[PDB]
């Protein structure tokens, strides 16, 4: 009851799990000792944090937070350090320790020493594109990695089949503006114009019969997230499924 | 027009709006007409005076019928010599109940009656009789403002002869607060995922209250979210406020809330309360 | 056995200037310092080989050159040529050419006779402009000297409606340029912006609303246009709707009083009316300015 602490954990699925604890000043405790401090002629507190440490709770383990920290001391404030976890596959809720050491202060003496440790479980918990018919999974072998400079480049759509008639389908890009609150008309028009006119796909109806190369050229700039347009089409009626994947800044 | 107050301020205003390329800048109660004014401050800091707006507006309902009056039924100066003169207030008791088409006057269809009562109104010739260049020639002009509705018949050409110039002139408060200080936080980004190509919104503030607060929000990211933890390092210059953050996470509910409910506060050094924050992630 | 036509927007850079079409358009735009892009559209031919050896595939359009486009056995390859688009202020295109059998049958037209009879005329006259220059010469890969051509009149199908207003300005309504003072203004300064609009010969379909409402929309040069309440970004005088005539070269204005920015973009659209779904075209003229 001097410094309220909370830990927030965010699940970055393309990397490690990120969890950050957060100290604060706990105002419902500060006016308490503010009353006696301004009784003794002091305006704000001088609590000194001298040893702050998060340890990985286990039989025994410890971690290290993902940037640098000094030995600090603040009056009415909040600080928050971040430490990276390891992104679990399924069903193992890890736990942490989070010890701390607040050192209070008085007139060049009487440093009433305090310490605190709140151990709890660090599990807040709130690119394969499947075919959705017969598990013909597609993945780009270098997705989201392309700094092109309006030059040619090549990608790799590694199709993974049932190995049962593995020669079936054809890619294409569809350079055509799709035909679609008036600025909601205009934002959709600018999105559909920059999608259907910015890159070209130099191997158009490539008719793949399990890698591909798919050379593009890319004649306008801007971050093309999710790279729409690049559809495939298969032996059945309409397997017009997307890739929905891969991105390229073009500057 | 916005102008100076009644003191010796001499503020270097440069923004204005006179209708200089049109004379007819319309408006229809659903769109904006945003008017912007650059009031640059003089040799001292900008004070707390009361300024004065000057708007020379007019309603549309007198303008549109001038071609229904001074063109349709006052063509010849002998046909409008005495026919209009003895029944001008009878015409102004006739045209005041016109009830024009101000429901579809956005796209087209200016100068049409919107069918209030078109057929019963021609009985006025019976109980009062005047010159037939008005008493018999303007009912055809009443049909010529019933049908024949021009979408834009260059209405600024026949406007200035009969349009009255109303002029509202409201005040202008220059309403503000009074606490000047500064800040400069500095930052250095720590890698999460990959650099997402961060883009800046702004940095400025203005506040005065009791147990006063100054909240800030971060920049704007346009890659995949949950992005890089910005590590920050303060230079809380020219005052002694109260910090509340260290090394936040730039696509989240975190906010570097540098509050200021404290002392070391100069007053009225600029146009308002101001504290130029100017965060630097370099 | 297909066809597609794509416009052009990026000026490009010198370090990538090694593929044939970008050095052609850059070399053509070293002189003639009024055009930059949006006038050098780019058509996508896709050669396919139904034979059993490689071929080498030059193409010359007008003064365009190629590379040694080595094609393979059953391999489709896509070959990229740039053309300046067909200006309707250098020509008129309202002439049907009679065929070479003068049998005097004197047939009908049998549609909206002022629209499809000149609309299909627009189609195969733009096809006449594409056919009448495009030249290819092919020789088989190190096994012959069989240097022949490859005719196209059994190959280019028709033009669809994308491939009319992509090739031919004057299928859509107003030609628009944007005349600006500076691109490199500081913060506290006031700028007249001046669009210049050119109503067309093919406004003859309507004439009803002589007044036609535009808009001016401001884009950030990343994405995501600013609202009407452009708070702390850009300032302006009056509502931006600012009508034009379907009569002659009308002008318009705003006063872009800039505030605390960098790298903006201005473009228009044409809306014919005030209501929603009145909007009929979106021009692509995108003059960018920077703010320091």
Curated annotation (Swiss-Prot), chain A:
Highest taxon listed in the record's lineage: Eukaryota
Subcellular location: Cytoplasm; Golgi apparatus, cis-Golgi network
Regions annotated as coiled coil: none
Record's miscellaneous remark: Present with 1660 molecules/cell in log phase SD medium.
Subunit architecture: Part of the multisubunit TRAPP (transport protein particle) II complex composed of BET3, BET5, TRS20, TRS23, TRS31, TRS33, TRS65, TRS120 and TRS130. Interacts directly with TRS120 and TRS130.
UniProt function note: Specific subunit of the TRAPP II complex, a highly conserved vesicle tethering complex that functions in the late Golgi as a guanine nucleotide exchanger (GEF) for the Golgi YPT1 GTPase. TRS65 plays a role in the YPT GEF activity of TRAPP II in concert with the two other TRAPP II-specific subunits TRS120 and TRS130. Involved in cell wall (1-->6)-beta-glucan synthesis.
Protein's UniProt name: Trafficking protein particle complex II-specific subunit 65
Gene that produces this protein: TRS65
Curated annotation (Swiss-Prot), chain B:
Family named by the database record: Belongs to the TMEM1 family.
Function: Specific subunit of the TRAPP II complex, a highly conserved vesicle tethering complex that functions in the late Golgi as a guanine nucleotide exchange factor (GEF) for the Golgi YPT1 GTPase. TRS130 plays a role in the YPT GEF activity of TRAPP II in concert with the two other TRAPP II-specific subunits TRS65 and TRS120. Required for both the cytoplasm-to-vacuole targeting (Cvt) pathway and starvation-induced autophagy through its role in ATG8 and ATG9 trafficking.
Entry's localization field: Golgi apparatus
Name assigned to this protein: Trafficking protein particle complex II-specific subunit 130
General remark: Present with 432 molecules/cell in log phase SD medium.
Disulfide bonding pattern of the chain: none
Subunit structure: Part of the multisubunit TRAPP (transport protein particle) II complex composed of BET3, BET5, TRS20, TRS23, TRS31, TRS33, TRS65, TRS120 and TRS130. Interacts with YPT31 and YPT32.
Curated annotation (Swiss-Prot), chain C:
Record key words, sorted: Golgi apparatus, Phosphoprotein, Transport
Keyword Phosphoprotein: yes
Keyword Transport: yes
Compartments, as annotated in UniProt: Golgi apparatus, cis-Golgi network
One Gene Ontology term from the biological process aspect of the record: early endosome to Golgi transport
GO cellular component, one term: early endosome
Highest rank taxon of the organism: Eukaryota
Similarity annotation: Belongs to the TRS120 family.
Assembly: Part of the multisubunit TRAPP (transport protein particle) II complex composed of BET3, BET5, TRS20, TRS23, TRS31, TRS33, TRS65, TRS120 and TRS130. Interacts directly with TRS65.
Function in brief: Specific subunit of the TRAPP II complex, a highly conserved vesicle tethering complex that functions in the late Golgi as a guanine nucleotide exchanger (GEF) for the Golgi YPT1 GTPase. TRS120 plays a role in the YPT GEF activity of TRAPP II in concert with the two other TRAPP II-specific subunits TRS65 and TRS130.
Other facts: Present with 259 molecules/cell in log phase SD medium.
Record protein name field: Trafficking protein particle complex II-specific subunit 120
Protein species of origin: Saccharomyces cerevisiae (strain ATCC 204508 / S288c)
Name of the coding gene: TRS120
């Amino acid at each position: 009851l001097l410094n309220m602490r909370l830990r927030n954990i965010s699940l970055k699925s393309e990397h490690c799990i990120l969890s950050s604890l957060d100290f604060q000043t706990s105002k419902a405790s500060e006016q308490l000792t503010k009353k006696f401090i301004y009784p003794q002629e002091h305006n704000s507190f001088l609590k000194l944090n001298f040893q702050e440490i998060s340890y990985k709770l286990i039989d025994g383990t410890s971690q290290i937070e993902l940037d640098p920290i000094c030995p600090l001391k603040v009056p009415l404030t909040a600080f928050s350090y971040d430490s990276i976890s390891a992104t679990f596959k399924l069903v193992l809720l890890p736990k942490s320790t989070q010890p701390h050491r607040v050192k209070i202060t008085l007139a060049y003496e009487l440093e009433l020493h305090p310490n605190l440790k709140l151990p709890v479980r660090t599990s807040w918990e709130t690119s394969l594109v499947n075919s959705k018919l017969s598990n013909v999974k597609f993945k780009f072998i270098n997705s989201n990695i392309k700094v092109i400079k309006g030059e040619k480049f090549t990608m790799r759509l590694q199709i993974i089949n049932s190995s049962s008639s593995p020669l079936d389908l054809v890619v294409y890009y569809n350079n055509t503006i799709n035909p679609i609150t008036l600025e909601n008309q205009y934002q959709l028009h600018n999105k559909y114009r920059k999608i259907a006119e910015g890159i070209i796909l130099l191997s158009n109806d490539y008719k793949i019969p399990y890698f591909a190369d798919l050379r593009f050229i890319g004649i306008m700039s801007g971050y093309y997230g999710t790279l729409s347009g690049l559809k495939v089409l298969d032996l059945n009626t309409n397997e017009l499924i997307e890739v929905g994947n891969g991105a390229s800044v073009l500057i | 027009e916005l102008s100076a107050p009644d003191t010796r301020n001499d503020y270097n205003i440069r923004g204005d709006y006179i209708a200089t390329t049109p004379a007819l800048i319309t408006f229809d109660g659903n769109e904006s007409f945003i008017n912007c004014y650059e009031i640059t401050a003089n040799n001292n800091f900008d004070s707390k005076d009361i300024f004065n707006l000057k708007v020379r507006y007019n309603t549309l309902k007198e303008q549109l019928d001038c071609f229904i009056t001074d063109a349709v039924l006052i063509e010849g100066d002998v046909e409008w010599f005495i026919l209009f003169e003895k029944w001008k207030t009878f015409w102004e008791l006739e045209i005041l109940k016109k009830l024009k088409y101000d429901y579809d006057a956005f796209k087209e269809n200016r100068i049409i009656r919107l069918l209030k009562t078109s057929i019963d109104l021609n009985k006025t010739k019976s109980k009062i009789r005047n010159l037939c260049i008005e008493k018999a020639v303007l009912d055809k002009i009443l049909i010529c403002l019933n049908k024949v509705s021009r979408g834009i018949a260059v209405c600024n050409t026949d406007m200035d002869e009969y349009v009255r110039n109303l002029v509202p002139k409201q005040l202008t408060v220059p309403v503000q607060l009074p606490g000047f200080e500064q800040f400069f936080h500095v930052q250095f980004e720590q890698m999460e995922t990959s650099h997402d190509a961060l883009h800046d919104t702004i940095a400025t503030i203005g506040n005065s209250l009791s147990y006063t607060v100054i909240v800030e929000n971060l920049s704007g990211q346009w890659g995949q979210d949950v992005i890089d933890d910005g590590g920050y390092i303060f230079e809380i210059l020219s005052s002694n406020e109260w910090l509340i953050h260290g090394q936040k996470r730039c696509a989240i509910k975190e906010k570097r809330k540098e509050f200021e409910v404290h002392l070391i506060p100069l007053k009225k050094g600029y146009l308002n309360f101001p504290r130029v924050e100017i965060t630097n992630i370099n | 056995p297909s066809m597609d036509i794509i416009p052009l927007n990026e000026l490009f850079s010198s370090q990538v200037e090694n593929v044939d079409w970008i050095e052609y358009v850059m070399s053509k735009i070293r002189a003639e310092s009024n055009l930059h892009s949006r006038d050098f559209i780019l058509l996508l031919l896709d050669f396919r080989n139904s034979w059993i050896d490689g071929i080498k595939l030059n193409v010359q359009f007008e003064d365009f050159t190629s590379n040694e486009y080595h094609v393979e056995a059953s391999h489709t390859s896509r070959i990229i040529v740039p053309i300046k688009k067909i200006d309707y202020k250098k020509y008129n295109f309202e002439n049907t050419p009679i065929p070479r059998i003068f049998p005097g049958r004197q047939f009908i037209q049998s549609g909206l006779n002022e629209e499809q009879t000149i609309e299909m005329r627009q189609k195969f006259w733009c096809r006449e402009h594409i056919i009448s220059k495009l030249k290819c010469n092919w020789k088989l890969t190190t096994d012959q000297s069989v240097t022949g051509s490859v005719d196209f009149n059994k190959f280019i199908e028709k033009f669809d409606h994308k491939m009319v207003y992509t090739i031919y300005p004057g299928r859509l309504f107003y030609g628009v340029q944007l005349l600006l003072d500076e691109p490199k203004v500081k913060v506290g300064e006031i700028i007249n912006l001046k669009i210049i609009t050119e109503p067309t010969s093919t406004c003859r379909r309507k004439q009803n609303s002589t007044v036609n409402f535009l808009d001016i929309v401001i884009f950030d040069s990343k994405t995501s246009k600013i609202l009407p309440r452009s708070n702390r970004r850009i300032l302006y005088n009056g509502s931006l709707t600012k009508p034009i005539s379907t009569t002659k070269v009308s002008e318009i204005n705003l006063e872009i009083i800039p505030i605390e920015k960098g790298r903006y973009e201005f473009s228009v659209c044409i809306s014919k009316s005030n209501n929603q779904d009145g909007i009929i075209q979106f021009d692509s003229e995108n003059v960018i300015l920077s703010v320091i």
